[PDB]
Amino acid sequence: MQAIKCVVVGDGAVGKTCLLISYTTNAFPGEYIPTVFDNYSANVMVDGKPVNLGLWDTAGQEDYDRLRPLSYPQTDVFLICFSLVSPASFENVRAKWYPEVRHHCPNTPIILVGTKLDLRDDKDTIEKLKEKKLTPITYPQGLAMAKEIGAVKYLECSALTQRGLKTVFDEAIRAVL
Amino acid sequence: RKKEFIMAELLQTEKAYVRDLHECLETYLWEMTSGVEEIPPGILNKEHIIFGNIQEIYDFHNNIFLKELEKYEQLPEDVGHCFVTWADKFQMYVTYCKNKPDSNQLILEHAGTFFDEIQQRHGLANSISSYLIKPVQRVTKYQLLLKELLTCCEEGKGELKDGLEVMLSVPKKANDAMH
Numbered sequence A: 001m002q003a004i005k006c007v008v009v010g011d012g013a014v015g016k017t018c019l020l021i022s023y024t025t026n027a028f029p030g031e032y033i034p035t036v037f038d039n040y041s042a043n044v045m046v047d048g049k050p051v052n053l054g055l056w057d058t059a060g061q062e063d064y065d066r067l068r069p070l071s072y073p074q075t076d077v078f079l080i081c082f083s084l085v086s087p088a089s090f091e092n093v094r095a096k097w098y099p100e101v102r103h104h105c106p107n108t109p110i111i112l113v114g115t116k117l118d119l120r121d122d123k124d125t126i127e128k129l130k131e132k133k134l135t136p137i138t139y140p141q142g143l144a145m146a147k148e149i150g151a152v153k154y155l156e157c158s159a160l161t162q163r164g165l166k167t168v169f170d171e172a173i174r175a176v177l
Numbered sequence B: 001r002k003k004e005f006i007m008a009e010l011l012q013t014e015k016a017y018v019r020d021l022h023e024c025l026e027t028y029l030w031e032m033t034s035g036v037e038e039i040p041p042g043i044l045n046k047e048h049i050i051f052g053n054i055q056e057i058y059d060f061h062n063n064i065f066l067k068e069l070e071k072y073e074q075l076p077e078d079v080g081h082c083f084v085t086w087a088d089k090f091q092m093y094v095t096y097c098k099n100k101p102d103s104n105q106l107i108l109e110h111a112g113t114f115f116d117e118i119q120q121r122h123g124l125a126n127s128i129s130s131y132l133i134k135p136v137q138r139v140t141k142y143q144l145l146l147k148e149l150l151t152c153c154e155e156g157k158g159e160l161k162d163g164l165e166v167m168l169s170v171p172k173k174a175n176d177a178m179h
């Protein structure tokens, strides 16, 4: 049965750990957001074909440019993530994440994931951004970034509501099959 | 309440880290050192390259660090001191990180499916590679737990700051040690 290593990369603002927890437990953790998600694997069926999906977090390695690539070899698919309500994380897809992932893994598929979809329409989040002369990241912006990096898909999700969340990981697997 | 959830996670994840290294040592490593199975010439007598100093990391955690963290369970605001006390031991993650690329290529280029065979045989969810990244994960995670404690512990909290300092310095020094 096919084994799949999927690594999750991107800025601290994406909520990488919360994403993975919410996905694997089928619930936003709410009460307390754990800082630790340990390497995970489970059987999921996608388009019939059953598969063993492996998930690695990288939270905590955001400042260690030489330690991060220790996780990259033999990855089957990357999720490169940014938060929809952090333009700085979005720009880092291009400045930081894509270059290193490509440098180490030139032929590995990338899914581009915008997280915190639940905040893109949130008045307080919007106003906090307007006070810095910024706005949330919209759909065509993600599509244009996906195209620029060679991403096979651009997908938007919320760990909070689960909207789009299961699809992210379905599509990660489809990108390998 | 928040400081208690973080401390609990600290301890629970320390226990899992100890269990994880212990499993790695007694399956993947024990098959190489045992004398029970067919060892590829490509890796023979190179368990030192593959596993680096992971024995010694495990012994630190299993003999010392976990017992001490446990003593700070009801003292979350003081736990930074644990990292100060034991700062010298964390220097071994610098050695471990340095070696890790040599480890990975060695397993790639020369081990074929020796370790996959072992994994299937023991019924392990985690591959040898999954286990061997763990020290790199753990050593960069302590600083996140200390930052969380800083967001919810009072000015009785240079007993977090100095701990965090140490736990920022170790991974940076490991990072700066890579070629």
Ligand SMILES: CNS(=O)(=O)c1ccc(CNC(=O)Nc2cc(C)on2)s1
Binding pocket: A014, A015, A016, A018, A019, A085, A115, A116, A117, A118, A119, A157, A158, A159, A160, A161
């Ligand atoms: C912007 N950060 S915040 O102001 O601290 C805040 C965090 C969480 C908040 C509630 N919404 C989410 O977590 N939605 C997520 C998390 C992931 C991954 O994808 N969607 S509001």
